[PDB]
Amino acid sequence: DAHKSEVAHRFKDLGEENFKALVLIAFAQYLQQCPFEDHVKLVNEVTEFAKTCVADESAENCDKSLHTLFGDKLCTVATLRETYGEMADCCAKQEPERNECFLQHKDDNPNLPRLVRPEVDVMCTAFHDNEETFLKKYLYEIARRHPYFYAPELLFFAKRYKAAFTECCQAADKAACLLPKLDELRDEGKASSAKQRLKCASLQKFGERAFKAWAVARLSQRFPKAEFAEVSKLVTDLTKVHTECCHGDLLECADDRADLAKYICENQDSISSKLKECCEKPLLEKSHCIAEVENDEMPADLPSLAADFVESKDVCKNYAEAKDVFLGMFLYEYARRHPDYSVVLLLRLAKTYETTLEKCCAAADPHECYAKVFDEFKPLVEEPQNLIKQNCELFEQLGEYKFQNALLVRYTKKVPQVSTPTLVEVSRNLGKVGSKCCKHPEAKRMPCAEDYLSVVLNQLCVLHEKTPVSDRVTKCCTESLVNRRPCFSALEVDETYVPKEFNAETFTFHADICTLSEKERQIKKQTALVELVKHKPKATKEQLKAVMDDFAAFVEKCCKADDKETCFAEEGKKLVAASQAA
């Protein structure tokens, strides 16, 4: 924007309140390993500095460009820098240089605990004793575990967080009033983080060319009743925003986000009739809703494509002279008239249409060349549906657990070279899709699935990326985006895998297993199974799905055995030695 003290420009538009946090995030998303006090200090130190910039724009450094004032204030530590012998010490670099050498250090999976909750009465207690130190830490614990969270969205949560307390902290059993709403939050937040990560990942990995086509797709379905170039307008608007939330430019990311809120609430009419009640609520609750709203009704008369995109004999006339924007119409039109279609599906189609025009505009009699181009669509607009059908029908039989086990093997046979902890975190999550998609009607089961799946396949690629072990994966991950899911399902087994070296400390379990949560114990069964298949890949399931039964009946035998931490080494000795038979 046009301003000298760039700091203050945003400071105003966002407000002292939406600063101390939009800045707490920044530090949290950067230094993650660093404690609470360290971050509140630095924020309550960039606040004073940012207060003098509210005075005279030409003070100390007020003229600077945030990134500068940021990284600098970050090297105010150089203390815990011992935990960073290399990396995060590169403040020697200038601009951009070091700011890049910062967005890189962000750990996608930090070595942290789950946040254990104090009992419900102790939470409300701390909520009163200091209603602000409380809400701050929540905003922080999350932002350090999710370095790529939609920074502004993360604000809205702390709002629903405060409210969740301000209401639920008064009733005979306020306890059971609160949690069922914190959990909605816990998850619903964890879900947003995963979607956003994908958006950022599609920017830093496939430029914005790819990104836009996504918005053109999900912004059409959402606001179908709105001009093509009015959407192509919001699409480009939204892009700049998300580019700056991924780039770490939080303040301006929110500043731009709100700027859109205002705007779309102005052109509320030439956009849809669902923004109504959402504009009448805080600029905070504003942005959020607007994007996660309901789709609007289709157009009355519909040109039903065809003549508009396949029949018009002089196709290339508007193609070789347009390409982009022209294909953008095709998308806008197609997507807007398919609130049932998955976003990834519309793109496979559009990239299919593009694969046709570029092949037909190079042959005699082109206007009759394609024609049967929509003939390609059929298997592709069905294949996904037939897949969701299968795996859902299967999910409703094996149940979430045993199902995650099916994948644990299939996906672990396909690429054993992959980190064991990942194969679990991922496979478990793939199983989690069936739970929150096979509850939907056939029409809406299409997106939810292909979408949630897209998300999870990414947190596979973002994990493997830091530690590349199977170039087969990196092949599926780097080679195209709207070809990721198709790629993996296509992967076959691996005869070139040398069965992992035994290691008994692995298949050795202890009474520690007994004192575990139902899930963190399942996750142990999971991890066990993975390291297992990796040990002798060419093994059938009826055998695994037997050795596993044995183990389950074992862990459940030495958790009920009179007083046994002794049999985990006696019966466990037998189990290992026994299973090796077959």
User: Residues interacting with its own copies, by CB under 8 A?
Assistant: 33-38, 40-41, 77, 79-80, 82-88, 100-101, 104-105, 107, 111-113, 116-123, 125-126, 175, 417, 419, 466-469, 498, 500-501, 503-505, 508, 510-512, 514-518, 520-521, 559-560, 563, 565, 569
Task: Write down the least CB distance from residue 480 to its own copies, Å.
Answer: 20
Length of the chain: 582
Cβ atoms of 10 and 53 within 8 Å: the answer is: no
Nearer CB in complex with its own copies: 59/112: 112
Q: Which two tokens stand for residue 133?
A: 């130190």
Q: Report the C-alpha dihedral over residues 182, 183, 185, 190, rounded to 10 degrees.
A: 140
Question: Which residue's entry shows tokens 């600098």?
Answer: 72
Using rule CB under 6 A, residue 183 touches ligand LQZ: yes
Which of 490, 269, 540 minimizes the C-alpha distance to 387?
490
Piece of the chain touching ligand LQZ by CB under 6 A; list 169-177, 180-188, 206-214, 267-275: 180-188
Taking CB within 5 to 8 Å according to partner kind, which of its own copies, ligand LQZ, none is near residue 439?
A: none
Query: What residues contact residue 298 under an 8 Å CB cut-off, 6+ apart?
Result: 224, 225, 336, 337
Nearer CB in complex with ligand LQZ: 142/349: 142
Task: Write down the least CB distance from residue 7 to ligand LQZ, Å.
Answer: 36
- In degrees, to the nearest 5, what angle opens at C-alpha 170 toward C-alphas 167 and 173? 115
Taking CB within 5 to 8 Å according to partner kind, which of ligand LQZ, its own copies, none is near residue 123?
A: its own copies
* Whole-angstrom distance, CA of residue 532 vs CA of residue 110: 26
Nearer CB in complex with its own copies: 1/129: 129
Taking CB within 5 to 8 Å according to partner kind, which of ligand LQZ, its own copies, none is near residue 187?
A: ligand LQZ
* Whole-angstrom distance, CA of residue 198 vs CA of residue 452: 10
Count other Cβ atoms within 10 Å, centred on residue 304. 9
Indicate the annotated binding residues for Ca(2+).
Answer: 6, 13, 244, 249, 252, 255, 259
Taking CB within 5 to 8 Å according to partner kind, which of its own copies, ligand LQZ, none is near residue 560?
A: its own copies
Taking CB within 5 to 8 Å according to partner kind, which of its own copies, ligand LQZ, none is near residue 581?
A: none
Which of 579, 543, 573, 547 minimizes the C-alpha distance to 558?
573
Taking CB within 5 to 8 Å according to partner kind, which of ligand LQZ, its own copies, none is near residue 501?
A: its own copies
Which of 165, 166, 133, 147 minimizes the C-alpha distance to 43?
133
SS (H, E, C) 126-181: HHHHCHHHHHHHHHHHHHHHCCCCCHHHHHHHHHHHHHHHHHHCCCCCHHHHHHHH
- In degrees, to the nearest 5, what angle opens at C-alpha 260 toward C-alphas 258 and 261? 60
Task: Supply φ then ψ for residue 186, to 5 degrees.
Answer: -40, -55
Taking CB within 5 to 8 Å according to partner kind, which of ligand LQZ, its own copies, none is near residue 183?
A: ligand LQZ
Show contacts with ligand LQZ in window 389-448 (CB under 6 A): 428
Nearer CB in complex with ligand LQZ: 183/280: 183
Question: Which residue's entry shows tokens 């830091």?
Answer: 466
Cβ atoms of 224 and 297 within 8 Å: the answer is: yes
Task: Write down the least CB distance from residue 519 to its own copies, Å.
Answer: 9
Piece of the chain touching ligand LQZ by CB under 6 A; list 104-112, 179-187, 268-276, 406-414: 179-187
Q: Which two tokens stand for residue 497?
A: 């895998």
* Whole-angstrom distance, CA of residue 287 vs CA of residue 284: 7
Nearer CB in complex with its own copies: 447/537: 537
Nearer CB in complex with ligand LQZ: 395/554: 395
Indicate the annotated binding residues for (4Z,15Z)-bilirubin IXalpha.
Answer: 240
Task: Figure out which of the listed residues 187, 297, 479, 570 binds ligand LQZ, where binding follows CB under 6 A.
Answer: 187
Indicate the annotated binding residues for Cu cation.
Answer: 3
Nearer CB in complex with its own copies: 241/463: 463
Piece of the chain touching ligand LQZ by CB under 6 A; list 183-191, 208-216, 259-267, 377-385: 183-191
* Whole-angstrom distance, CA of residue 267 vs CA of residue 279: 11
Nearer CB in complex with its own copies: 4/106: 106
Binding site for ligand LQZ (CB under 6 A): 183, 186-187, 428
